[PDB]
Motif scaffolding. Sequence first.
Motif, mmCIF file in Angstrom:
data_model
loop_
_atom_site.group_PDB
_atom_site.id
_atom_site.type_symbol
_atom_site.label_atom_id
_atom_site.label_comp_id
_atom_site.label_asym_id
_atom_site.label_seq_id
_atom_site.Cartn_x
_atom_site.Cartn_y
_atom_site.Cartn_z
ATOM 1 N N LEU A 187 -56.916 -94.126 3.923
ATOM 2 C CA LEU A 187 -55.826 -94.882 4.531
ATOM 3 C C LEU A 187 -54.474 -94.231 4.251
ATOM 4 N N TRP A 188 -54.442 -92.903 4.312
ATOM 5 C CA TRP A 188 -53.206 -92.154 4.125
ATOM 6 C C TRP A 188 -52.433 -92.109 5.437
ATOM 7 N N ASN A 189 -52.056 -93.283 5.933
ATOM 8 C CA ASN A 189 -51.401 -93.395 7.232
ATOM 9 C C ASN A 189 -49.914 -93.718 7.130
ATOM 10 N N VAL A 190 -49.241 -93.719 8.276
ATOM 11 C CA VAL A 190 -47.823 -94.049 8.346
ATOM 12 C C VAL A 190 -47.558 -94.992 9.515
ATOM 13 N N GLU A 191 -46.967 -96.145 9.221
ATOM 14 C CA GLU A 191 -46.699 -97.149 10.246
ATOM 15 C C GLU A 191 -45.243 -97.603 10.219
ATOM 16 N N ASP A 192 -44.651 -97.752 11.399
ATOM 17 C CA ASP A 192 -43.269 -98.208 11.511
ATOM 18 C C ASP A 192 -43.201 -99.665 11.955
ATOM 19 N N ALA A 194 -37.941 -100.413 9.434
ATOM 20 C CA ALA A 194 -38.384 -99.681 8.253
ATOM 21 C C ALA A 194 -39.734 -99.007 8.478
ATOM 22 N N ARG A 195 -39.890 -97.810 7.921
ATOM 23 C CA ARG A 195 -41.152 -97.085 7.996
ATOM 24 C C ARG A 195 -41.967 -97.296 6.725
ATOM 25 N N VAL A 196 -43.251 -97.596 6.892
ATOM 26 C CA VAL A 196 -44.124 -97.872 5.758
ATOM 27 C C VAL A 196 -45.261 -96.861 5.657
ATOM 28 N N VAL A 197 -45.381 -96.229 4.494
ATOM 29 C CA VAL A 197 -46.479 -95.307 4.230
ATOM 30 C C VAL A 197 -47.544 -95.992 3.380
ATOM 31 N N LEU A 198 -48.805 -95.843 3.776
ATOM 32 C CA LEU A 198 -49.899 -96.539 3.108
ATOM 33 C C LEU A 198 -50.855 -95.591 2.393
#
Lengths: 107, 47, 107
Positions: B22-27, C31-35
């Motif tokens: 789950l090394w993802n990026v979401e805005d 805001a941008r969120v990294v998981l």
Amino acid sequence: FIQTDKTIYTPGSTVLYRIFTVNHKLLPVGRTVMVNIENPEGIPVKQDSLSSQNQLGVLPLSWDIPELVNMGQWKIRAYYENSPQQVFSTEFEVKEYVLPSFEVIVE
Amino acid sequence: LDEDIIAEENIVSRSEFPESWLWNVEDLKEPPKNGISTKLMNIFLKD
Amino acid sequence: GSLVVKSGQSEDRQPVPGQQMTLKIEGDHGARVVLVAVDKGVFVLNKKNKLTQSKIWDVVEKADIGCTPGSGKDYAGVFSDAGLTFTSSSGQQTAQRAELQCPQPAA
């Protein structure tokens, strides 16, 4: 602020680390960052020079750990190009391990 | 086959055993309410 | 601001390997969120060198220019001991500061 997915890695796997670039107000900023990776004996092996320009203060990076390498405590050192004296670092251990199936707490 | 059990050809083994995913990026650009956006992600749990 | 991560399913119990699940993310707009998801078994071998919001403020506080809980010996001391410099046309100024770090903690 350096962030690594795991805390410990095995020789052969890949390390995923992100570098957060912000100012004194903790607000994101676009600057030039120099990132190095030293081995247990304090010897740089990889050095990058990316910019957080228009990247919203987040620099995604990755490095593959060779099978032939010394185990112990590794370190990732990064610093702004405009201030070599101020360096930030985060350590990640490299060891031949195997994920257990239970945790142990001593209170 | 007729036994009250499952054959070997019908057992799909679990292979995906990642240590970190789950090394993802979401805005969060969704319609804000009270200054708090809300994104609903549909992740795929590993084995 | 604020960043919360809870289960999308407002019901039910524990999932099953391979099953999908909604993941609600409540953060600030724009805001941008990294998981990143990691097996807890990893932290059993090493839980050090992680990234915590508390560790961030701990660094910010250390980089503070103020070196006194409050007050001072005189008027020129109050400002200096609070991270400020006073200078007037009458002559009243503060003590010259020429050292980066705060006073060496002399117990």
